[PDB]
Amino acid sequence: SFINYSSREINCKIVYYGPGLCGKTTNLQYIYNKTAAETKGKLISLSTETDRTLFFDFLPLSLGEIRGFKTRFHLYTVPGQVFYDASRKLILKGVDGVVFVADSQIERMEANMESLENLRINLAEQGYDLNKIPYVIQYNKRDLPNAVTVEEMRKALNHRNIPEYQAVAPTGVGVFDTLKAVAKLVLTELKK
Amino acid sequence: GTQLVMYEEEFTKINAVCDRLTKDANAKVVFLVDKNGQLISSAGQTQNIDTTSLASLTAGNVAAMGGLAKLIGENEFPNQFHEGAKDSLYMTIVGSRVVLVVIFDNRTSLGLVRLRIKKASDELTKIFESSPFAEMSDDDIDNLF
Amino acid sequence: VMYEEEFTKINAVCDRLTKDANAKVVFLVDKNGQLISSAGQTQNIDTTSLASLTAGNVAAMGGLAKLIGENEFPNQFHEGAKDSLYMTIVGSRVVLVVIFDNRTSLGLVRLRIKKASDELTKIFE
Ligand SMILES: Nc1nc2c(ncn2[C@@H]2O[C@H](COP(=O)(O)OP(=O)(O)OP(O)(O)=S)[C@@H](O)[C@H]2O)c(=O)[nH]1
Ligand SMILES: [Mg+2]
């Protein structure tokens, strides 16, 4: 994070992580769609022609004011397909909080676990520890018929009873819940 | 995140370096961005232009070049140049976590830009050479949205 | 498959460009970030990472150009110490990456990159 005392601005970086097609970019598109002009910048989306994220999405968001400092949250999503790993590592630099977006389809459970170990690895390799940073997990795609139960995703993905949110990103369900949860964990960390 | 703070002591000098370069090198815009994407300062005709997006693409570009330089066994390319027919753009790494960016009209020779940039960068490392949370409570946080 | 025919002909263009410009290595990268072809000294280089960082760099540069009222910047030249790196967009979808040591001039690489581009733009057609 970066605090400009002169301009009274608190800046925090939040990165959405998870496997390919799991819904990271849909989270940001929803947030952008529903936020008044006066609290958001422009949504940058570096994507392929089939809309897969190729480098990152970026959305700057202002969440109000705490003790007369404006809060600016810099939201990123990574490219989730395995072979973008080199680009994916770049986005984690200076991350203040992480949202891990998991796809609830049984056919993507192993992609979820692979992506989660990839987030642990990538953080360790630049000197962070997922067990020690503000972290929430989103079980996205709860609408789909082939979605596994919340309890089986907890067993596969969530060992420290990290805050977990059910979402259906395209309708917005769970999206602002997830953002509010990691944003407050980040702000609680600074308070310490 | 490394908890980083900037008091108006060093902010005011950094802004001064920037508006020097836009006036002298006839830059259309100037700005300073952390490697992690955080915009630190801008300067120039930043009306009608999104310096927050610019800072984010810049740090993404520099980080991708960073990894490529490392892949072909080199160090981070100290700067990058990108000519345009109308407006052109030059950037250089200032220190270990900062990037200075200048885009200018091509009615301003490249030689004059890399001149003022030799000094402004050297000036910036001279500046780098030099609490809201204490009274905060969890209602301040919970009441944010 | 006539894909077998095209893909050896793509390697041909890359191989000719590596010799005719005295380069170290040549990569042909889709804007998708997937490697299309590679000629030259590739043994000690992760080619998945290189394709991914190359597509990411071009995408970032593009989004930036689009902000400051300029079309996508066509070429990037990033001179290093013992080596150099040149990049060009061939047509719409492909990025050509030429890494060459400093005993080679950028002006020859660009001269040779012109004809490789057309040889590639017509292989695609
Ligand atoms: N049914 C259903 N579809 C969803 C849900 N969330 C996202 N999708 C769909 O899945 C597809 C992928 O979403 P997207 O946000 O682009 O994935 P991503 O995580 O950003 O993917 P990538 O950039 O790593 S490849 C889109 O078609 C999107 O509409 C969901 O909650 N329920
Ligand atoms: Mg995406």
Author numbering:
A (entry chain A): 2 to 193
B (entry chain B): 2 to 131, 143 to 157
C (entry chain C): 6 to 130
Task: Show the paper's wording.
The localization of motility complexes, and thereby the direction of movement, is determined by an oscillatory system, which includes Mutual gliding motility A (MglA), a small Ras-like GTPase, and Mutual gliding motility B (MglB), its GTPase activating protein (GAP) as major components. In this study, we report the biochemical and structural characterization of M. xanthus MglA and MglB (MxMglA and MxMglB). Thus, MxMglB plays a dual role in increasing the GTPase activity of MxMglA by orienting the catalytic residues (role of a GAP) and by facilitating exchange of GDP with GTP (role of a GEF). Allosteric binding of the C-terminal helix (Ct-helix) of MxMglB on MxMglA facilitates nucleotide exchange.
In the structure, a monomer of MxMglA was bound to a dimer of MxMglB. MxMglA interacts with the MxMglB dimer through an extensive hydrophobic interface involving β2 strand of MxMglA and α2 helices of MxMglB monomers, an interface similar to that of TtMglAB. One of the novel features of the MxMglAB–GTPγS complex is the asymmetry between the 2 protomers of MxMglB (labeled MglB1 and MglB2). In MglB1, the N-terminal amino acids (2–7) comprised a β-strand that formed hydrogen bonds with the β0 strand of MxMglA, thus continuing the central β-sheet of the MxMglA fold. α1 helix of the Rbl/LC7 fold started from Glu11B (residue names with superscript B denote residues of MglB) of MglB1. However, residues 147 to 157 of the MglB1 protomer could be modeled into the electron density, which adopted a helical conformation. Henceforth, this will be referred to as Ct-helix (C-terminal helix of MxMglB). The Ct-helix of MglB1 bound to a pocket in MxMglA distal from the nucleotide-binding site. The binding pocket in MxMglA was formed by the residues of the α5 helix, β2 strand, and the loop connecting β2 and β3 strands (β2–β3 loop) of MxMglA (interswitch region of small Ras-like GTPases). The conformational changes between MxMglA–GDP and the MxMglA–GTPγS bound to MxMglB resulted in movements of switch 1 and switch 2 such that Arg53A and Gln82A of MxMglA are now oriented towards the catalytic water. Analysis of the crystal structure of MxMglAB–GTPγS complex showed that Asp150B, Asp151B, and Asp152B on the MxMglB Ct-helix formed water-mediated as well as direct interactions with MxMglA.
